Design an enzyme around this catalytic site. Sequence first.
Site, mmCIF file in Angstrom:
data_model
loop_
_atom_site.group_PDB
_atom_site.id
_atom_site.type_symbol
_atom_site.label_atom_id
_atom_site.label_comp_id
_atom_site.label_asym_id
_atom_site.label_seq_id
_atom_site.Cartn_x
_atom_site.Cartn_y
_atom_site.Cartn_z
ATOM 1 N N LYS A 18 -8.898 -12.043 8.791
ATOM 2 C CA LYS A 18 -8.047 -10.771 8.876
ATOM 3 C C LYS A 18 -9.200 -9.898 9.430
ATOM 4 C CE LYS A 18 -5.973 -7.079 5.726
ATOM 5 N NZ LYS A 18 -5.666 -6.297 4.304
ATOM 6 N N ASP A 74 2.411 -4.145 -4.649
ATOM 7 C CA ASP A 74 2.675 -4.660 -3.322
ATOM 8 C C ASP A 74 3.211 -6.043 -3.498
ATOM 9 O OD1 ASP A 74 3.390 -4.297 -0.770
ATOM 10 O OD2 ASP A 74 1.472 -4.311 0.165
#
Lengths: 256, 244
Positions: free
Chosen positions: A24, A115
Amino acid sequence: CVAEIGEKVFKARDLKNGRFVALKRVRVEGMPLSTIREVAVLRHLETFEHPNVVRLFDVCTTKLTLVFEHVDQDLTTYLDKVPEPGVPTETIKDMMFQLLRGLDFLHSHRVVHRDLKPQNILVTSSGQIKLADFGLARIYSFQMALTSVVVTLWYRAPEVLLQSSYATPVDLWSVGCIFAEMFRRKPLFRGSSDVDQLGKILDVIGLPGEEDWPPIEKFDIDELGKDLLLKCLTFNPAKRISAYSALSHPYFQDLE
Amino acid sequence: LNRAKIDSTTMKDPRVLNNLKLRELLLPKFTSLWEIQTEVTVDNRTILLTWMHLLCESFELDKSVFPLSVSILDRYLCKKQGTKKTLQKIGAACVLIGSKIRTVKPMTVSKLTYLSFTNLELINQEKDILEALKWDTEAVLATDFLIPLCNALKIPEDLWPQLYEAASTTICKALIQPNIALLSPGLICAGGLLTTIETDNTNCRPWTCYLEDLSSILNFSTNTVRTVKDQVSEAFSLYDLEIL
Ligand SMILES: c1cc2c3cnc(Nc4ccc(N5CCNCC5)cn4)nc3n(C3CCCC3)c2cn1
């Protein structure tokens, strides 16, 4: 780096092993609020080595790189290609277990992962759940302030939409929505605004009485899942089951 | 902005108190305060901690932003050497980091620099503290224990909002003082409630009726509890802005 697996989340190999890892490469007020939160939590809890939460390996620094364990696929790709008639009966019971397990974990450490979505939930080749993306996640103390924007539109619990203050039941909402999506391999609630979304929902659970205010097979499920799913989508959030209380519920007792 | 309200999962589950006790053992007990330090001293800390607290009080940050910043700062100051000058850059970075984690509207770099080093130097100092700790920033704060300790103590649920406000406030000022930095988060917190219950005369039992059970709950002796109360009340009392 090779092929992106997230909108920016890469995929590459390493000089140690050419083993699989997720990269990431976070593009950088100083360091983004969210990644600092994400990592902070993950390193806080990591020595507990919970089965159901991705591991993190390193950070380094202009650009920033955040290095995780790799997983076969996201549950999004899974449901989008699992041979007809889709996810089997009991594979379904099983992933619901691990999900509620890694989330019994979390909440017990006063963490909320707000989330929860199949884009985010991960599935190893051996069919195990790995919860990911902890950007909106943080420790819940009491009387603490809250933004008014958690979860992607479709998985957002009512009370959030109603602009009330949220908590842990926010996680269980998405769960009893992912519980739903799993059987019927398509998102259960597909609104377009905070108000449309509260409608798609409210024209299912029905009209909550004066006390709960601040057919379901209708939408192939066990008689028992359909009490769990009702327990995770009870409008009143002080009525919604807890991942602990849910792990013990009868839908689960027959299990690997 | 609306506020987190009671959550049985997160405040009344008995294994939350358990797991706090646990992860409390993941911040290794400081040998002495700022051992690794050649220049700056504990005196320099009570000051900076005092500014920092004020900076957290004046901007109305969530009660758990100052404990975390104090935690971060000490920790960083085991693994790195800091000057008498930079000592303010540093403590202002800790609040920068700690806010981003435990509070919804962070302190900004402007607010942290406009009143104090440049907007870049501070950011680079967020970096330096981030590296040094390898981004393991969160921690168990004395603050984390208040409600689970209130549940554990079978205190009537509706007294929690006032007690949370009183005690978290008493706690945060104590944390400024040196001798509070050694005590374990759970204990600092227990002192908080008792120091507070004594003061306000809240419709509880009198505070001595929580001593033998806070012993049980935290697993310390009814003497360690008393000392931790006294120590804390005292550290509260030692607060002085004219120290600045
Ligand atoms: C930390 C670690 C991970 C992580 C590790 N492995 C995988 N594996 C993975 C997922 C999806 C795909 N597919 C490729 C073809 N297109 C569809 C999808 C393939 N592999 N995804 C991860 N994510 C994702 C969560 C949502 C976005 C990034 C992480 C987030 N944080």
